Amino acid sequence: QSTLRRAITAAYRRPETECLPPLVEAATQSKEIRDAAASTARKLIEALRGKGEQFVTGETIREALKRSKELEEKGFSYSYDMLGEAATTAADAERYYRDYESAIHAIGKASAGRGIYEGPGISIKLSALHPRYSRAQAARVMGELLPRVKALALLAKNYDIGLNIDAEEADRLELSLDLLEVLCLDGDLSGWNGMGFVVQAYGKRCPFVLDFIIDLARRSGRRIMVRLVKGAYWDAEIKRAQLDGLADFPVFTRKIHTDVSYIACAAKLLAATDVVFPQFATHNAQTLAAIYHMAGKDFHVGKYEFQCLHGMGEPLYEEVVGRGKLDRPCRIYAPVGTHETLLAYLVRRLLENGANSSFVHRINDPKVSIDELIADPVEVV
Amino acid sequence: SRPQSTLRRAITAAYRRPETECLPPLVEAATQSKEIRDAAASTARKLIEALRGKHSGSGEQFVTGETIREALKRSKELEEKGFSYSYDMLGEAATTAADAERYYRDYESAIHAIGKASAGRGIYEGPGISIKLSALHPRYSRAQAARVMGELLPRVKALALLAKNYDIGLNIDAEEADRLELSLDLLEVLCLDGDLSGWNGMGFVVQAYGKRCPFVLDFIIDLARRSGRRIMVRLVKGAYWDAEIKRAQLDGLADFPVFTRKIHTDVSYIACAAKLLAATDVVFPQFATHNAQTLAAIYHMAGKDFHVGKYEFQCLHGMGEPLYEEVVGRGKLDRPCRIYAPVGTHETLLAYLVRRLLENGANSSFVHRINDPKVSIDELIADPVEVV
């Protein structure tokens, strides 16, 4: 219970028309920045337009770790995800826990003291770790989940690697956020800045979650890693919201509004790089160019990074990483597992890649001009 | 008693009957002689070895055209080889009354176009259409059966009357388990409607992953006898398995309306195929599958006597043509195959494509196992009935 937590609850289903004015103002860039971003985005898109096995990095963490050397030398880093989610039995949640535990040991040993920015890390889904994650009361779920996540966080602290909590459906944002707060106030994890958390910009609550996390970082002394994404579950959220007869949804219903929300939330994160580590996860060259110029000329490893999904982001970020390009780092999200554990992730990649509104679809669409692809969302909204 | 009391009571009783209680009758009905099993194994081995190597050892490929005119032009090649077509104007789960009206006009336009292209070839050799009832009512899964039926029935009857006037097939696709009962009641009213007399093009899908499947087939076969219609029956395994599992979990069910072990669906399919093959005087079985072992089993179960119109196989565009190029035609198995042909753009491909990904990407699917290095040809041709 706090003023910052109340802003989150109040925004849950705020009407879309009332959410946007503060985002538009925050996402408005100076003419100089807009012109520079348009130039960079054009260069990236011209390069791209000259360019489920593809989505999985390896079957095992040993296999995926071996395959990461080539791109790590080019300026990429990795976040490994042992595939698995939505556990329905205690046995499944225990197996996912042991998968994550063994991955941390292997990743942490491979990190070899490179630390949380230059070395690899791990991503986890809370729904893999509790057999009734979405069907039981949030209070009891968090309490049974807490010792498992704390144990994993303690292992990540032992090796000094990143451990990110992925974001899933909207009705579990609050639970996962409460877990993040308990961990960041837990003295057994002091001195480790590897805890990471995803916030989804297609959510109406996003900037208020970001206010809460930035303040939590500042008062806890933890430099929380914050992965800003647009979001992967849009079709399911819409279908659930429609089934519930809800007049106002927890997510935006126009893609341009999510784009404006992302840029507005990026501005908020870039103003807080003292206390959080922003991670800008996107495959959209206009979004990337905007953030690249919003961040200014000062850069050091550990200030911020970009991120991308394995099999989707490499052609864009080959134009970004390295000293002959933009000299900014990118962390590749690397799924690890069998084809069967991959299926649910694959479905969301199909919804992402196949949507006519998606950047990665439009980049191949002969009816979509480069002019349209470099359009600034605020000037279009 | 209430009309068809016993048949209707059997369907309701099976709805959520324990899986272990459903299987013994299906296994016995699915049992075939050793001679037939050896012959089917040899046929299945031949089909798989031909599959690979005509295709080097191995989602626009699922759509036949953006418009029905474009799709009909593209059908000429495979029709010349002896395939037929069932066109589906992509669209489902209408959320508005206006959307339901748009889908109805798409189906209506398509029947005129398909009927002209058919040019009197009839329901077996000529093309037909498939429809989804969820496209035609704006709250199909949410509204009371009274309201849905009373509004849906005139629209489906109007479409059936058009299909009768051109003598083409009109198939009702099967969707989620909770709409089986409504769709079956609609089938009954249409088959008893005298305005549709003399046309045998009405078709209906039954999903063998459902516990009700054999009792639904008993009801349909009896309906064909008392109505005098030869009902076209498409036997499938089922496309919504992942969604059905999730829905039953959220409904708090102790027992699901579908099987949870994949080989149980295989046994159910073969047992239901045996029931259909014994009733070809009053139904037209349509065996929809991409599984070469299932195909071979039904090919040998059906015996040596065949004529076009007895039964057919079916496949999805973009999935089944390589298998059935080893089936259609005098030098192959000399059995016909109807290709299900989606028609539309990306504004309508979505829901169907997700179900294709779940089908193609599942470790348990034949189309995935045929490319899996861990699966021997021995396993691909194994009779599932022998495993249980």
Ligand SMILES: Cc1cc2nc3c(=O)[nH]c(=O)nc-3n(C[C@H](O)[C@H](O)[C@H](O)COP(=O)(O)OP(=O)(O)OC[C@H]3O[C@@H](n4cnc5c(N)ncnc54)[C@H](O)[C@@H]3O)c2cc1C
């Ligand atoms: C490294 C990485 C990690 C990620 N982690 C997560 C995670 O933990 N949880 C999560 O949910 N997502 C996560 N995502 C995001 C998700 O997987 C997609 O990759 C991302 O949303 C695509 O955005 P884009 O900027 O690349 O592309 P764009 O094409 O610019 O944006 C597409 C996005 O717009 C949104 N959208 C589409 N249509 C509409 C509409 N009508 N109304 C409103 N919004 C709409 C959706 O969010 C969609 O994904 C992650 C992405 C990356 C790269």
Ligand SMILES: Cc1cc2nc3c(=O)[nH]c(=O)nc-3n(C[C@H](O)[C@H](O)[C@H](O)COP(=O)(O)OP(=O)(O)OC[C@H]3O[C@@H](n4cnc5c(N)ncnc54)[C@H](O)[C@@H]3O)c2cc1C
């Ligand atoms: C022409 C045609 C029309 C079709 N029409 C419809 C329709 O109207 N409605 C519909 O629902 N389906 C329909 N289908 C079926 C669906 O689209 C799939 O193509 C079909 O189920 C795949 O079965 P298969 O015999 O080709 O493959 P197989 O690999 O032999 O069987 C796979 C099937 O097994 C089932 N299954 C998978 N895992 C399990 C499990 N753990 N427990 C139990 N069962 C399991 C599922 O039904 C899955 O699709 C149609 C198929 C075709 C070819």
Ligand SMILES: O=C(O)Cc1ccco1
């Ligand atoms: O799982 C998803 O589809 C979204 C996502 C990508 C990386 C982490 O989460």
Ligand SMILES: O=C(O)Cc1ccco1
């Ligand atoms: O729509 C689905 O996925 C199942 C299906 C295939 C053909 C008719 O229905």
